[PDB]
Symmetry: C3
Subunit: 29 residues, 3 copies
């Protein structure tokens, strides 16, 4: 339970960082 929830939070954190960088790319063209 705990370990699966921690994995899902880490995957969201990684997606979170990738979407931030992608939104920054789109702002600059």
């Amino acid at each position: 339970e705990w370990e699966a929830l921690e994995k899902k939070l880490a995957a969201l954190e990684s997606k979170x960082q990738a979407l931030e960088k992608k939104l920054e790319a789109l702002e600059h063209g």
Copy 2:
């Protein structure tokens, strides 16, 4: 409290995928 944390993570994973797809759309016009 644990169940609520999981329902909140599930809503956030759905919002995460929604933002990812909208960013993909914006990227292409």
Copy 3:
């Protein structure tokens, strides 16, 4: 461990809100 999970989720929810606001500003503004 509990506090760290709750903190990560609040930070992700907050980042989710910041990223949606930037996306709306880029798409429409």
